[PDB]
From a paper:
By binding histone H3–H4 dimers, the histone chaperone ASF1 facilitates nucleosome assembly and turnover and modulates histone post-translational modifications. ASF1 consists of an N-terminal 155-residue immunoglobulin-like domain (ASF1-NT) followed by a presumably unstructured C-terminal tail. As expected from prior structures of human and yeast ASF119,20,59, ASF1a-NT adopted an immunoglobulin (Ig) domain-like fold, composed of a β sandwich topped by α helices. Specifically, phosphorylation of the C-terminal tail of histone-free ASF1 by tousled-like kinases (TLKs) increases its association with the H3–H4 dimer and downstream chaperones, which has been suggested to promote the provision of histones for chromatin assembly.
Numbering used by the authors:
A (entry chain I): 9 to 23
B (entry chain A): 1 to 154
C (entry chain Q): 11 to 17
Write the structure that this text describes.
């Protein structure tokens, strides 16, 4: 869960 | 700053069946006359594990945009469950609304999305393979993440 | 890829 949360947030900001 | 500013996004029929289409009422404004189209996209994050399962649900061009404030309804068909990992089907994922000018993404509006069974029988004993006809999409519209990128507006 | 009119 915590790792998947981190992954989703990256998508939100990403580049 | 940027020549286009997104003022608001409204998620319409937000809690709905998975197979029903997305609907967003988008309102932006433009400081001056624009030479080319604004390309809007809706992107469904199929899997948190890899961006290669992203689905571009749709892509529209809003053509010649004057300098006023404008509104339009962006509707897109639901993602293709045949491209979604079963592990990611049920649970939380992300949907993205992006706008692009001359091929340069300048704004990205993201929402968390929870796909969940509504019958307690299924919630307590999930199908071995996600049954998308029984899933409810819940776009968590209260808290969007807005990310802006600098682009060339010449 | 698809055209959309403003309202």
């Amino acid at each position: 869960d915590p790792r998947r949360q981190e992954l989703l947030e990256a998508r939100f900001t990403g580049v | 700053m940027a020549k286009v500013q997104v003022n608001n996004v409204v998620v319409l029929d937000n809690p709905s069946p998975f197979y029903n289409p997305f609907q967003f009422e988008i309102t932006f404004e433009c400081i001056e006359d624009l030479s080319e189209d604004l390309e809007w996209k809706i992107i469904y994050v199929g899997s948190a594990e890899s961006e290669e399962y992203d689905q571009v649900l749709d892509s529209v061009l809003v053509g010649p945009v004057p300098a006023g404030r404008h509104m339009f309804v962006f509707q897109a068909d639901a993602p293709n469950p045949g491209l979604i990992p079963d592990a990611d089907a049920v649970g939380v994922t992300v949907v993205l609304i992006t706008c692009t000018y001359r091929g340069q993404e300048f704004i990205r509006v993201g929402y968390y999305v929870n796909n969940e069974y509504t019958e307690t029988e299924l919630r307590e004993n999930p199908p071995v393979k996600p049954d998308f006809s029984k899933l409810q999409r819940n776009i968590l519209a209260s808290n969007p993440r807005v990310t802006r990128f600098h682009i060339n507006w010449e």
